[PDB]
Amino acid sequence: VIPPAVRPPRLFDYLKPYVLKMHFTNKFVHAQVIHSPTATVACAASSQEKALRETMGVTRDVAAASKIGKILGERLLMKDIPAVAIHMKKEQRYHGKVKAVIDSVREAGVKLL
Amino acid sequence: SSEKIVASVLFERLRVVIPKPDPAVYAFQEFKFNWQQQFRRRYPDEFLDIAKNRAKGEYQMDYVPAPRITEADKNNDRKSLYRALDKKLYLLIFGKPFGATSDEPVWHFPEKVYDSEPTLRKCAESALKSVLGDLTHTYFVGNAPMAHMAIQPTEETPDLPSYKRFFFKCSVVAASKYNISNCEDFVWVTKDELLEFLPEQAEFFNKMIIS
Amino acid sequence: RISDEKQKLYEQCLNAPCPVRSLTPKEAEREAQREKLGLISKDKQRDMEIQKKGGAAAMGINTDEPMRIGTAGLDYVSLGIFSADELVKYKVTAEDGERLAKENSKVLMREHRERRAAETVLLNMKKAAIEALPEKLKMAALEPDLTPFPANRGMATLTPPIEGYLEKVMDAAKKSSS
Amino acid sequence: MKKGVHPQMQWISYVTQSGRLMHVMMTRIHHVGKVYHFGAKRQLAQSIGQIAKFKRRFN
Amino acid sequence: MFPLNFHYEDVSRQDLLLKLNYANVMEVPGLCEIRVVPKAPYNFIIKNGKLAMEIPCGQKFIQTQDLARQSTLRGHGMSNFLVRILTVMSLLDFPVEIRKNSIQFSMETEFCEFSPELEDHFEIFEHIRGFNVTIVTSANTQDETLLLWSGFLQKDEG
RNA sequence: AAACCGGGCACUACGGUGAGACGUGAAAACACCCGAUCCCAUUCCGACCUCGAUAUGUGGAAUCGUCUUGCGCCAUAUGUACUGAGAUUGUUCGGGAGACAUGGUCCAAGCCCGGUGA
Ligand SMILES: [Mg+2]
C-alpha cells in the first residue's frame, strides 16, 4: 500500500511546543528537542559532539543512549524547559536505545507530555 | 613495435585440510552449541532406545583419521603435493625465462611467448602442457588473466625489449604427482616461500595471490 | 497394524520438555499470577516433575564441563588442530557468553574484511590486465567462462585423505560390480 | 531462534570415500554421536539390449 | 571453520571472480536460505509426518491455516543441512533442476534410505512421500546458479 | 569567518511519484558487508526488526548527485458544450468548461550537530 504522509498530532486544548526526536546511526546516538512554532532546535545532545565523543567509550550502544538522555535532561532543566513531548518515527518502539533515551530524560526530571 | 606477449601459468593446489581457526571463534561455537541445548527439546529415552536396543556389536573396525602433519612436512620434502595441507602450493620451474638478464637459470612459472594463437588461454594451456605433459588433471580458471606485468627497459639494461607478462590461474584437480619436464628443477612452495624465492617481485605477488 | 503406541511416542517427541523452562517476562508474570490464584499449567507441572528428580543436570546439561564439538575421541585437540593450552576456557553462562560473542564478532569482522580487501585488489588487477591487451585478445578474454567446476576436485575437511583408502574402496566397488 | 521450541542437536562424524573426517550436526535421535562411513555404492543400473541379448544368445 | 562456508569463501568466490565479469566483489552470489516443503498429498494428522520433517531440518516447521507446512533454514543451520544433503548426493545420481536463482531438489524416501544417520529410525520415514528442498542463491543469472551448484557438489570419485 | 560538504528536523507537488543511462563514498558523515550471547524479531527462520561488533573493505541493495523522459502537477490559450438575466416564439448583455493545443518542473529558502576550510 502507499504509505500515508505522517502528520503531527492535532491540537486539542494546549500547544505543547517542545518535541523530542531521536536518531541513531551505526556510530552515534542523537536526541533533538524541537521548538515547533519556530522550527528551531531548543536543545540537543549527541555523542558526536566534540565535548562528548571523548568523555564516553562507546558512542553507539544503549549505554551511550542513556548517557545522552541524561545529558539532554540536565540541559533541558538548565534552559528552564520543564516538559517535552515524545515523537517516535515509523520504526521506533519503546525498546532499546529509544527506551534508554526516554527513561534517562524522565529520570533527569523532565516530564513527558 | 612493442610485441612478444608472454603468458604465465599460476599452477595451484588448493588446501587439503581446513586451517586452524581462531580460538575465540571455536570457543564461541562450542559455547553456542552448549548454551542452546538448555532451551531445546530433549527427546525421551524410549525414542533413543529404538537405536540403543539394536545397537549391535560387530567384528568391529576402528577408524583412525590421517594426521594433518605428513612425513613430507617433517622431512621438508619439496616437489611433494602432500605437505602443508592447510596451505596452498604453487609450482615453480627452474630454467631460462623469456627475459635475457643472463644465461643462468632462475626460478619462474611456466611461460610461453605468444605468436599467432586466437586466445592467451591457448598460450597458457600450451605453456602448461610443455611442463606437465598433459592437461588431464588440470583446470584453467577463467578466460581472462588474473594480473599482468609491463616490463620496460631501465638505464642499466637497454638491450631487453619491452614486453607484457600475463598470469593465468590453473588448479590441480586430483593428481598428487606430476611428470615435470622441459625444465631443470621444480618445487612446490607456499605463498610465503614463493615470496622468499622472489624477493624482488614480492610486492606484486603479495597482491596477485590471496593468502 | 499401525501402532498407536509408536504414534504416542512420536507425540511425546514432538512435545518433549527442555532442561530449563524459559519464560517471556510477559508470560512470567502471568505464571506468577496463576501461582497466586492456585492454577498450575501442564508444562509447569511437568517442569516441577523434572525438578523434583534433579533438573538440568539430570537432563544432560552441566556448566563446568561443556560438550566438545565432534564425536568421542575425535575432538579438535585429538585431531591435532588445536593444542590443549591454546583453547579459550569458559563456562556455560551468559556472562562468559557476552565476552565470547563480542570477541567472536570482532575476529570474524576482521577476517571477513581482510578477505574482501584481497578480493577487491585481485579484481582491480584483473581489470587492469584485461585493459592492457590487444583488441582481438581483449575481446576473447572478456567472454565469460561458463565451464562448470570439476567434480573431481575435493573440498577441504578436518582430515586429509588416507593413502590406501579411496583406491581400496573403488577396487572393492569395481570387483563387486563385475 | 525461539527458546523452548526446537529439538536438541547432536554432533556426529562423517567419513567420505577418501577417509576425510567431517563433523556435522544432527537432530539428537541417538544417545551418543556416532561415526558414519560413506562407501562408493553409487549403484548404477545396466540393462542388456536386444542386440546384445541376440549376440550373447546366438553367437 | 565449517567445511561448506570455508569452501565457498576460500575456493568458489575467487574462481567466480576470475571467471565472470563483476564490477565489485559484492556482486558475487552466495547462499541465502533453504526452503523445505513436503510433497503435495500428505496426511496432516499423523505425528509420523511431523517428526519426519522436524528431524532432518533440525528446527520446527510452521503450520499455517492446516493447509501449508514450511521450514526455512538460514545461517549455520542452512550450511549444516546443505553439507548433509551434499554428502549423501555422492551415493547416487539424484536429479536437481536449476531455476533462475534457485536449486530445486526432491528429497524422496530413497534419499532418507541412503542417509547413514537415518538408516535407523527408518520407520519414521516409511509411507512418507518426501519433501521438496529449495536452495535459494543470490544470483541474477541461471548460469551463475549452475556454476555455484557445480562448485558446491564435489565428490572424491571421478 | 564566510562559503562548501554530511546527517537530523523544517519547507514543498513547477518542489510529487516512476523508468533508463552516467557518475559519486570527501583524512568526515550515511548505509551495507560480519555475528546472534543478553534485550528484541519469527503463528518456522537475524528474511524484517533488534542488540552487538567494523585503523578502513564496498556503494552490488538502498542513500546521494547529473542528465533524458513517463504519469501527474502548475500556468495559459483559441473555439465549442453548457449556463445567469432578458421573450423580436430568446436577433441582447454576461459567466464559461471537459477534451485539445502551448510551455514549465522554477525562483526563494530556516535551525542544530559534525567535517573541511580555519
Ligand atoms: Mg482547460
Of E10, E11, E120, the CB nearest to B50: E120
Expressed in angstroms and rounded, the spacing between residue B188 Cα and the centre of ligand 1 is 84
Q: How far is D59 from chain B (nearest CA, A)?
A: 39
Q: What b/e sequence results for E28-65 when a residue is b if at least 16 CB atoms lie within 10 Å of its CB, and e otherwise?
A: bbebeebbbbbeeebeeebbbbbbbbbbbbbbbbeeee
Exposed / middle / buried, residue C1 (Cβ in 10 Å: 0-12, 13-18, 19+): exposed
Please, which residues bridge with residue D26 across strands?
D10
E80 CA from F77 C1′ (Å): 73
Of C18, C74, C169, the CB nearest to D39: C169
**Contact B28/E at CB under 8 A:** no
Cell of B106: 632462475
Whether the CB of E21 is less than 7 Å away from nucleic strand F comes out as no
Rounded distance, CA E33 to CA A26, Å?
26
Whether the CB of D29 is less than 7 Å away from nucleic strand F comes out as no
Rounded distance, CA C29 to CA B78, Å?
69
Amino acid at E28: V
Phi, psi of B186, rounded to the nearest 5 degrees: -150, 160
On whether the CB atoms of residues A86 and A102 are closer than 8 A, the answer is yes
Alpha helical stretches, state H, E20-74: 47-57
Q: Strands B163-172 and D35-37: what pairing?
A: unpaired
Residue with cell 541474477: E140
Q: What is the secondary structure of chain C as a DSSP string?
A: ---HHHHHHHHHHHT---SS----HHHHHHHHHHHHHT---HHHHHHHHHHTT--SGGGT--SSSPPPSSSTT-STTTTTSS-STTSPP--SSHHHHHHHHHHHHHHHHHHHHHHHHHHHHHHHHHHHHHHTS-HHHHHHHTS---PPPPTTS---BSSPPPTTTHHHHHHHHHHHH-
- Structural Rg of chain E based on CA atoms: 17
Cell of E137: 542463491
Residue with cell 565451464: C147
How many residue pairs from chains B and E have C-beta atoms closer than 8 A?
28
Rounded distance, CA C30 to CA C27, Å?
5
Rounded distance, CA A34 to CA A67, Å?
20
Rounded distance, CA C104 to CA E41, Å?
45
Rounded distance, CA E103 to CA E98, Å?
5
Rounded distance, CA D25 to CA D12, Å?
6
Q: What is the secondary structure of E97-151 as a DSSP string?
A: EE-SSEEEEEE-HHHHHT-GGGSSSHHHHTT---EEEEEEE--SSHHHHHHHHHH
Residue with cell 588461454: B121
Rounded distance, CA E72 to CA E125, Å?
20
On whether the CB atoms of residues C123 and E26 are closer than 8 A, the answer is no
On whether the CB atoms of residues B4 and B161 are closer than 8 A, the answer is yes
Q: Strands A111-112 and A83-87: what pairing?
A: parallel
CA A42 from chain centre, in angstroms, equals 11
CA C27 from chain centre, in angstroms, equals 30
On whether the CB atoms of residues B63 and C128 are closer than 8 A, the answer is no
Interface test with E, best of B15, B25, B31, B85 (most E CBs within 10 A): B15
17-56 on A, CB < 7 Å from strand F: 21, 23-28, 30, 32, 34, 39-41, 44, 46, 48-51
Of B33, B41, B48, the CB nearest to D7: B41
Angstrom distances, CA of residue B1 to CA of B5, B119, B162, C128, C137: 12, 20, 9, 21, 17
**Contact D28/B at CB under 8 A:** yes
Amino acid at C118: A
φ/ψ bin of A96: left (φ > 0), alpha (ψ from -120 to 50), beta (otherwise): left
On whether the CB atoms of residues D13 and C157 are closer than 8 A, the answer is no
C103 CA from F25 C1′ (Å): 29
Rounded distance, CA E94 to CA E90, Å?
9
E23 CA from F65 C1′ (Å): 20
Phi, psi of C33, rounded to the nearest 5 degrees: -65, -35
Q: How far is C123 from chain D (nearest CA, A)?
A: 32
Q: Which secondary-structure segment (H or E) carries B68? A: none
Please, which residues bridge with residue C36 across strands?
none
Rounded distance, CA B135 to CA C128, Å?
28
- Rounded to 10 deg, the angle between the C4-14 and B45-52 helix axes is 120
* Contacting residues for A76 by C-beta, under 8 A, at least 6 apart: A33, A43, A84, A105, A108, A110
Whether the CB of A94 is less than 7 Å away from nucleic strand F comes out as no
The DSSP 8-state label assigned to residue A10 in this structure reads P
Exposed / middle / buried, residue A86 (Cβ in 10 Å: 0-12, 13-18, 19+): middle
E2 CA from F41 C1′ (Å): 27
* Contacting residues for A112 by C-beta, under 8 A, at least 6 apart: A83, A84, A85, A86, A102, A105, A106
Of C160, A105, C101, the residue nearest B87 (C-alpha): C160
* SS3 category, A7: coil
Sheet holding E31-38, edge to edge: E62-63, E69-73, E31-38, E131-137, E102-107, E96-98
Interface test with B, best of C6, C145, C166 (most B CBs within 10 A): C145
Expressed in angstroms and rounded, the spacing between residue B93 Cα and the centre of ligand 1 is 84
Residue with cell 565535548: A51
